[PDB]
Amino acid sequence: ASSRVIVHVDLDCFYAQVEMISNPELKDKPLGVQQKYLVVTCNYEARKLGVKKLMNVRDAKEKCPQLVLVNGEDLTRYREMSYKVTELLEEFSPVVERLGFDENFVDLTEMVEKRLQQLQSDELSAVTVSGHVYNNQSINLLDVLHIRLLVGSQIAAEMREAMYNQLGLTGCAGVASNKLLAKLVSGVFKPNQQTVLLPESCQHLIHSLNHIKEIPGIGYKTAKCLEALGINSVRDLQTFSPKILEKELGISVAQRIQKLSFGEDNSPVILSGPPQSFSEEDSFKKCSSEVEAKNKIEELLASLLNRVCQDGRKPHTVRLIIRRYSYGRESRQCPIPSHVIQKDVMTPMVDILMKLFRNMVNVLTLLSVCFCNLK
Amino acid sequence: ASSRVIVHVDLDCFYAQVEMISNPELKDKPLGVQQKYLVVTCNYEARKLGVKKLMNVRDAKEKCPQLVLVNGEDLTRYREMSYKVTELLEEFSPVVERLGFDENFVDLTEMVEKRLQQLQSDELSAVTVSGHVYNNQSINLLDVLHIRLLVGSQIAAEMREAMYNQLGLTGCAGVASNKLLAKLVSGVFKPNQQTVLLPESCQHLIHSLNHIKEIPGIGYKTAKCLEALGINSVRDLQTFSPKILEKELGISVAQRIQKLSFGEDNSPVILSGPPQSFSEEDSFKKCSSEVEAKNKIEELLASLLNRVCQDGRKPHTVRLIIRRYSYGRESRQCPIPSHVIQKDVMTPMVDILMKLFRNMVNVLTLLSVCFCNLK
DNA sequence: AGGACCC
DNA sequence: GGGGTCCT
DNA sequence: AGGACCC
DNA sequence: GGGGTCCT
Numbered sequence A, B: 001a002s003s004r005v006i007v008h009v010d011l012d013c014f015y016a017q018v019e020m021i022s023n024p025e026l027k028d029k030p031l032g033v034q035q036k037y038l039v040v041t042c043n044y045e046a047r048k049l050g051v052k053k054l055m056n057v058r059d060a061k062e063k064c065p066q067l068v069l070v071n072g073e074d075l076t077r078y079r080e081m082s083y084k085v086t087e088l089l090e091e092f093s094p095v096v097e098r099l100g101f102d103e104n105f106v107d108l109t110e111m112v113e114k115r116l117q118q119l120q121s122d123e124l125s126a127v128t129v130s131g132h133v134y135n136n137q138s139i140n141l142l143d144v145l146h147i148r149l150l151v152g153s154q155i156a157a158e159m160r161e162a163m164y165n166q167l168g169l170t171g172c173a174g175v176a177s178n179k180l181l182a183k184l185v186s187g188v189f190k191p192n193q194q195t196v197l198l199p200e201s202c203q204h205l206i207h208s209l210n211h212i213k214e215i216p217g218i219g220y221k222t223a224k225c226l227e228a229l230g231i232n233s234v235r236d237l238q239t240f241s242p243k244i245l246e247k248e249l250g251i252s253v254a255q256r257i258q259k260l261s262f263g264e265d266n267s268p269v270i271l272s273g274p275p276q277s278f279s280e281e282d283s284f285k286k287c288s289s290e291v292e293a294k295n296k297i298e299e300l301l302a303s304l305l306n307r308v309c310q311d312g313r314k315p316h317t318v319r320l321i322i323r324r325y326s327y328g329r330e331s332r333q334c335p336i337p338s339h340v341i342q343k344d345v346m347t348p349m350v351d352i353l354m355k356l357f358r359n360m361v362n363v364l365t366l367l368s369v370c371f372c373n374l375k
Numbered sequence C, E: 001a002g003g004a005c006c007c
Numbered sequence D, F: 001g002g003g004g005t006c007c008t
């Protein structure tokens, strides 16, 4: 009757798990993936040693200091295994929303309902859960809603088995009645495990968070904005005057995060499909030097156009983005001339981006190109 | 081989022509439609007396000063006859782009081609033009392109006959090979006439303009921006250094208006379909007075919601817009809560718009509401 | 959210 | 004036 | 064009 | 870090 069953799939240590598949010799050698001076992520064969995501190399390294590092500044292989996952999930139900390269929501409502359509009266008593149940809560085989959530978790365990048999990947699921809760209950047991949340334990999940910043939807800026007003817990946010919430953020944000704080989230799962933009990015110590920076720009374009091509679609807008020292980024944008779309192409393309460059740079700590408006 | 046939349909004195249909007694009584202190438009039974569009009432009136005026601040009847026109044109070819309440582009390419598909070798010599030919230019019955443009104008004359037999409306057409030129050649003979432009007279059309501001695409601001640099004629704009054009407007605008200045326009005719927004607007002497201005806002909402309803679709964003004395307008915007979409509705709606109001008004010459993001 | 354009 | 469209 | 969010 | 999404 309008209650949903959503699954939130979230792969373990994604990048490190691609590097290990490519290079067995890194199988339980404690592994971190390197981008610039950061350990962007590391394997659980390494996490125990107090090595954390986005930890300094020097820090990550003093700990360990044989832990092993691979460069992961080129995201090609990760983007490619990432879409294989969504594609796999799409085979179950077509409505798959990506969050990042490693998270997916699937709306399982239509599938739970078909399955249960499909059972005799007896085989209805023997419906079992698969994996964890949040807060060790008792199942009631007569609660139409518990019955679905368990069938949910049966699907999830199938999605997980398949991600492993078909892509050699392990990870987590959370089943629950909306995206917020599903995203939250997928982390309870890590790393290669899954959890289902029964409606009666919703407040327990929600109140188990220590910081409002842990709510998907509330950011760094938002949080410190609430902290300023004296709102630190989920309950502070629950009990707090709508009128005061409006006087800081707008009725847009104010009414939405308050729902979030109660565990209430109506957003549907959206079909991501193909991406709305391809971009490429380079970051540095400084730069400033028109001509190489034309280089740096040349580099991004060569790689970008390869990617954009295969897709099949074509993009009708280019973007240039920069950063100074000293964020705090600045962008210029323009359409991509008709005849230029047909495809030669780099030559005329660089001219573009380079005027675009001059419109904000006279007399730089990052450069990046984006193609968007894909048709 | 990739050359198009576009028709640009543009109704005479649109509003005044709706008022005359509703009220015969205004048939050749020299008629102007009034909005506030302006004559927004007047009939040709009145234009000869040097009465012009957007002329003061006092001015429009000293001239004439029995000319007759009707209020046209409520655009309901005009919007309704307007869509009947597009709908009529849609019956010919489905791809109709609106410009305003009174202009339409139809791409006739597929239809000219079918018709000519459809003629015997003889009946190909007897293909005649219908209406004017721009610059009295000779037709060459062996130029595949003249042949189409004439078939174009045969369609246009049918569209016009039909607008008159079916809606009692008269107006103009221009046929030509792109939107820019079609829009330009439709005005050559006014008011109830049509013109076709053969490719050989394109420069004659283009150079017959006196100000660049007369090019559809070049505005008030743009123009005075070029005037500043010493570019006043179409040819000044033609011959003028791409590099200098970029240093004022961007490679976006710079490369596009230069094409325009040569008569070159690749933009396809786009299917407008249903509108992307409904708005309502009120303008005044001053205001300032929270409570009535809640009135003024109440008014717009009552009318807006009526309109929005019938459509069938529903809007997921509301907008509030204001203006000060003293443009120079200021807007706030927010989504329209899920449960509120279902539809009661004014009550919760006003609260919205009124906070939105306070976010820019402390301690006003126009107020208006917009619903957009229609799904 | 503002801003360029078009009627 | 009283509306619209797209782009940034 | 910038800005909030997410990985 | 190196990417993404939507909204204003």
Ligand SMILES: Nc1ccn([C@H]2C[C@H](O)[C@@H](COP(=O)(O)OP(=O)(O)OP(=O)(O)O)O2)c(=O)n1
Pocket (backbone or CB within 6 Å): A010, A011, A012, A013, A014, A015, A016, A040, A041, A042, A100, A101, A102, E007, F002
């Ligand atoms: N700010 C961020 C956040 C994440 N990632 C990357 C690194 C991870 O490999 C990956 C996917 O996101 P997760 O947050 O799920 O991080 P992990 O998958 O690495 O870890 P885990 O499941 O162990 O928590 O994308 C990144 O580069 N920069």
Ligand SMILES: Nc1ccn([C@H]2C[C@H](O)[C@@H](COP(=O)(O)OP(=O)(O)OP(=O)(O)O)O2)c(=O)n1
Pocket (backbone or CB within 6 Å): B010, B011, B012, B013, B014, B015, B016, B040, B041, B042, B100, B101, B102, C007, D002
């Ligand atoms: N700034 C403007 C421009 C136009 N209109 C209105 C008045 C006209 O009735 C109509 C349609 O546009 P046109 O520019 O074609 O103007 P007309 O149809 O009035 O006149 P005409 O064909 O005689 O030139 O919309 C308006 O209200 N405000």
Ligand code: NA
Pocket (backbone or CB within 6 Å): A091, A092
């Ligand atoms: Na399957």
Ligand code: NA
Pocket (backbone or CB within 6 Å): A212, A213, A214, A215, A216, A217, A218, A219
């Ligand atoms: Na968060």
Ligand code: NA
Pocket (backbone or CB within 6 Å): A216, A217
């Ligand atoms: Na989220």
Ligand code: NA
Pocket (backbone or CB within 6 Å): B091, B092
């Ligand atoms: Na017809």
Ligand code: NA
Pocket (backbone or CB within 6 Å): B212, B213, B214, B215, B216, B217, B218, B219
């Ligand atoms: Na113009």
Ligand code: NA
Pocket (backbone or CB within 6 Å): B216, B217
């Ligand atoms: Na135009």
Ligand code: NA
Pocket (backbone or CB within 6 Å): none
């Ligand atoms: Na468009």
Ligand code: NA
Pocket (backbone or CB within 6 Å): none
């Ligand atoms: Na969306």
